[PDB]
């Protein structure tokens, strides 16, 4: 590329020092740039690289209105859930993708980044809700979960729980309990002039 080229900030998203937790998933909007997907291809870091709606071999070839990069930390057994039509704890109550989802999902093992001797308890996942999340909904409420018939207004106790529970990341965790950083690149197809396009020799 020329030096004067305006590339998209995929480096900032994927190489951020600290990710938000899934319950409060972080959204960065990417617009009016040239999307270099060469940074993503052949990476020796990623353990999960899937795309929905588009083939990843034709990413350079496509233009979009906007690209939304969502980022959060999950455990190994729960990487399954960040996909269309998937169900679970983090899929229902934390972060939900549409069934008609057009985008890509990338994840890598961040064992040596997010685990800590003694345990890192800075990543919060929601465990309870009264209702399942809509696609691309974000719940950050601190309302006490009422599981019983009796109200417990603003007080935790029996049949009443704090909705947000802390992930425990130890360096000696099993594969499925080890932390994984996840980036969800969502491509937008709005009826407006496209801004994010691949290399000039492609599109």
């Amino acid at each position, epitope marked *: 590329f020329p030096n004067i080229t305006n590339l998209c900030p995929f480096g900032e998203v994927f190489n951020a020092t600290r990710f938000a937790s899934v319950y409060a998933w972080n959204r960065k909007r990417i617009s009016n740039c040239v999307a270099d*997907y*060469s940074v993503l*291809y*052949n990476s020796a870091s990623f353990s999960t*690289f*899937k*795309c*929905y*709606g*588009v*083939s*990843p*071999t*034709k990413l*350079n070839d*496509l233009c979009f209105t906007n690209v939304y990069a969502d980022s959060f930390v999950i455990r190994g057994d729960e990487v399954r859930q960040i996909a*269309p*039509g998937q169900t679970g704890k983090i899929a229902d109550y934390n972060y939900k993708l549409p*069934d*008609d989802f*057009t985008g890509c999902v990338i994840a890598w093992n961040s064992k040596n980044l997010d685990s800590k001797v003694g345990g890192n308890y800075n990543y919060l996942y929601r465990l309870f809700r009264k209702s399942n999340l809509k696609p691309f909904e974000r719940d950050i409420s601190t309302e006490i979960y009422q599981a019983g018939s009796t109200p417990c207004n603003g007080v935790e106790g029996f049949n009443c729980y704090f909705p947000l529970q802390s992930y425990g990341f130890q360096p000696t965790n099993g594969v499925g309990y080890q932390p994984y950083r996840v980036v969800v690149l969502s491509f937008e197809l709005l009826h407006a002039p496209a801004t994010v396009c691949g290399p000039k020799k492609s599109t």
Partner: antibody
Amino acid sequence: VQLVESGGGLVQPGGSLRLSCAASGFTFSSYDMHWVRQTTGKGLEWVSTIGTAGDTYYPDSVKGRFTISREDAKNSLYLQMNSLRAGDTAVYYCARGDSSGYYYYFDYWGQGTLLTVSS
Amino acid sequence: DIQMTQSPSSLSAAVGDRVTITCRASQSIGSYLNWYQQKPGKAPKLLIYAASSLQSGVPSRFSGSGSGTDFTLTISSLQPEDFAIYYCQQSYVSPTYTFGPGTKVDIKR
């Protein structure tokens, strides 16, 4: 438009072999390429993809064992296979990939070469 | 992944008959569906892409329909040459594309 497989034969378990797919009839450089295997019990299994931008993709049961190579210059496709198990005994096809819009498909297929992993 | 299931598993119809083959996806996959044809000692041939669009070089005899979960391949009028196993494949989840088990289409004469 033609694809021709080569290389398949008898390999001892824990061994290694390479497969070759000779392409013809189309601008090979501008099309993605795939290997797919076919087994008696489990049917058609995708094993590797190589893109037009040098990108490679694998299943987990594959990655770190098989590696897909590409020659834009010689209109050729390769699959280097290491650490072969009995459960790798299959008919390997090389197949082209194209898209009509966002929708992807495997339009042209090979002839099939049989890898057989036995002692 | 997305698991694909095909019905019926085996089928026998006479020359001229309309054959109906169904494919079920694990989840909602819009129209990202491809129909293939494989004869005894040959490689798959792409018949239908995008669940409905007919590939060129394929007899218009062949037809595709369906969106969401359930898809349908129809041979308008079965011919003796059409003896094959027919596979459906989803084009939604990449690069992990998955195939159905296949439906054997035998011919009554």
